[PDB]
Amino acid sequence: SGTDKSVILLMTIGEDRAAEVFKHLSTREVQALSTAMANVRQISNKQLTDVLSEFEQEAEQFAALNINANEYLRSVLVKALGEERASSLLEDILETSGIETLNFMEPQSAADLIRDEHPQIIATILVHLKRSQAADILALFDERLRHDVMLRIATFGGVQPAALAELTEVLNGLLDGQNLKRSKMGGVRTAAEIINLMKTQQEEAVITAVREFDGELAQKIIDEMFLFENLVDVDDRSIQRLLQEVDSESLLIALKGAEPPLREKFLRNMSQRAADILRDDLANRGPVRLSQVENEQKAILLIVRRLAETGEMVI
């Protein structure tokens, strides 16, 4: 049979080659081949030669020049329609057991679903669930239930297959219209974009109301509205004022972390000797951690906001 021929091929190609092939095979195929492999006792020379001949004849046809379909498709979609459309199309293309289905669900919904269950059952399901999903679910539980689950998981001794099957059937029965669960449309960022499109008086009202509410997401939107990479679109005088109001080291670090166009714009806005000194210091220095560069850019953006509010800078 073809399974026997594949088993003989895997035996005769070497452990490394067979292991590499199994990395390109599904779980069912790997399990079936391994089960067939363990029962192999003899492989005669005629059988070996026939297997080699058949495999070579099959490989003559393909010879398919295998391509990484996922990576190539992602790159094509990105370079064609941007990151957002590419990611949306990949999600559409990508889109089962009850436990596996729960792993494909929202944390709060699954948490409330299993919350109406015996704590041992909750612990068993969470063990059978993905670690990240289980951690998200447990963070939403009450302190007493969370402690009970953590205690039970620390003393988990395995479940009977019949109990596992019954639990899976119950979870399947409890399922709802989870098809196309959740949707990425917008929020916060879209609100910031809309605010940027509303009048100066309207954005004054916006500052007012956002400060009035929770305050935390208000500051988050303060940070979000306008970014450091948007400084390239500002007029030269505002950039020069920023150079005046920004320390040399912070500006140098920010330019190091920024794009060559923004760096060249800042250098042009600087004097010749100062720009040359900045370039020399950049060349003579070493790599800077991303956190430090981000902090310096945040400080520079705070200075940008301060100058813009006073009217010295136009955004």
Partner: peptide, 27 residues
Amino acid sequence: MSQRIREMSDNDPRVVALVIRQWMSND
């Protein structure tokens, strides 16, 4: 045991996986 074994060992693992899948389907 000629050089055919070495040539097969040098083939791409994806090709071997596809051949194995085809044989399993034909089973």
